Symmetry: C2
Subunit: 294 residues, 2 copies
């Protein structure tokens, strides 16, 4: 789809994890950003695969584009990131929220990481602060710190010709589905409420691009909505819902959810900017699954 | 159910893993064996739980029984063993096939086990050889080496009043379901054929007790059959099927199966006689998931 004149956005949906990855291109310079890419992972066998990522590679080439940014909205709990795989193939710089350091501190300890694992986000090329601008060719973008699902979550705002899009990560879902859970380490429902109200203070017509979609009641996949529709109809956080009410709802709801299938594999990879842990003396890399701890 | 006069057998079915565990008691002395017990494991969160095992504990106490043996037919790929939990709670000796050492060697390397990991089966109290006798109170039992699904698989024969039962592990399944897969390390279809033909050389009326049952076509769970019915009707290995034909079938079938959900957690625990790996310096135990190896 094209927003304004030059904001080109392709959505790629991963069936296994319900993740929506994006290719965001400046139609003029052909520079692009890949957002929230997926490295396929079979937890039964420990096998990774680049099939989903290769779709992005092919689309970049089909467009004659050049990757400038490999972005992650947050340290995902439900899938492994393909950012390292894609930066290697395609170039560009990886970026993530500056509060990655807090996530690394917490999960470096949980997974008892090896003593060379950096907790200062240096695995990533660029650490983004709240309201910090960045460019995708001639497109002006801005990173927004929108925590609550995690302490580090970012949303990416991009504007062209007076129209705005925001890639909101796991904050809002489609209006019929609600909002993201707030029970992972350092998550907080009240904080998510405030983040979402900042997002919903953008102009009504602003397009909002989802990070996951779970096909509720078997409808087709959806990935884009507007500020106006969220404010009117989001089942969790429409305009009528105050902070306290949201917090009570969200916290009671979180108590009923199970862990994502891939939380332990995912976080320990994504905290390393999409690298597998360093191999042991036998040449094999291992995920570590903490027992009776998470 | 009672075989002969004094061979008491209770079956316990685990829905999550389709494992059938057994309590086998001498009705006279009340001495018993627990076979192929399940320690519940949620791979998403890394949590173990003793719910299934506690069913056995309760049944032992209800019977006023005393555990003499905690047995495993093989190093299971589909569930974690509760043998260590049950031996601590109830006493008795653990036993497993003497060829455990070959499994330990192979998986000690795969999981790059810590140096204190023994590859001589010393984690188990007793290592059983082919046709070796053992007692459950006044009941005469015999261990049979029946490899093919794994190099170390054992079947346990028990006799009373001229009637025989055999707990066959993952060799035969019910006649309508066939036989076990032969693709795990050191498995071999030809070897499994020969093992099954030894089992099917027992008297026709011999009862055979299954290790898994997968409710094919939505039928109710079944766990016991006879030598005669297997020879007549087993869809994979009835009397009419020769060795070469079985091998071609079994090998072509194995190429289509996926890994068990819990293969990597299960085998690194079961190779340790049901102990979790020893904790690291932070006091947490971890499973190791080899990446891109299995
Ligand atoms: N069953 C899913 C759980 C996915 C999940 O929990 N996703 C998070 C975002 S990372 C969420 O907020 N789900 C929202 C909800 O269920 O209300 C899985 O195993 O991946
Ligand atoms: N889907 C099952 C796979 C279970 C499995 O592979 N069971 C083995 C015994 S440990 C088997 O032989 N299956 C035989 C077949 O389907 O032909 C799981 O995830 O646990
Ligand atoms: Fe998320
Ligand atoms: Fe098995």
């Amino acid at each position: 789809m094209i927003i304004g004149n030059n904001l080109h956005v392709d959505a790629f949906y991963d069936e296994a994890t319900s993740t929506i990855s994006y290719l965001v291109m400046d139609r003029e310079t052909r520079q692009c950003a890949l957002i929230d890419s997926v490295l396929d992972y079979d937890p039964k066998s420990g096998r990774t695969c680049s099939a989903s990522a290769d779709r992005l590679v092919e689309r970049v080439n089909e467009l004659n584009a050049s990757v400038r940014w490999v972005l992650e909205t947050h340290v995902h709990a439900d899938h492994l990131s393909a950012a390292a795989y894609l930066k290697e193939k395609l170039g560009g710089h990886t970026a993530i929220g500056a509060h990655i350091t807090q996530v690394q501190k917490v999960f470096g300890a949980l997974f008892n990481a090896e003593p060379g694992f950096a907790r200062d986000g240096s695995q990533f090329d660029v650490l983004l602060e709240d309201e910090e601008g960045f460019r995708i060719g001639n497109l002006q973008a801005r990173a927004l710190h929108t925590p609550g699902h995690t302490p580090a979550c970012m949303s990416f705002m991009i504007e062209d010709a007076g129209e705005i899009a925001v890639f909101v990560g796991d904050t809002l879902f489609m209006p019929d589905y609600g909002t993201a859970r707030c029970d992972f380490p350092g998550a907080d429902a009240r904080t998510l409420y405030r983040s979402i109200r900042r997002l919903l203070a953008f102009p009504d017509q602003t397009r909002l691009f989802m990070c996951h979609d779970y096909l509720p009641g078997g409808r087709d996949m959806q990935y884009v909505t507007t500020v106006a529709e969220q404010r009117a109809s989001n089942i969790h956080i429409h305009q009528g819902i105050d902070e306290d009410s949201f917090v009570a709802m969200r916290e009671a709801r979180d108590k009923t959810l199970e862990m994502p299938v891939l939380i332990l594999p995912s976080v320990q990879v994504n905290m390393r900017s999409g690298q597998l842990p360093p191999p042991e003396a036998n040449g094999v890399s291992y995920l570590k699954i903490p027992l009776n701890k998470l």
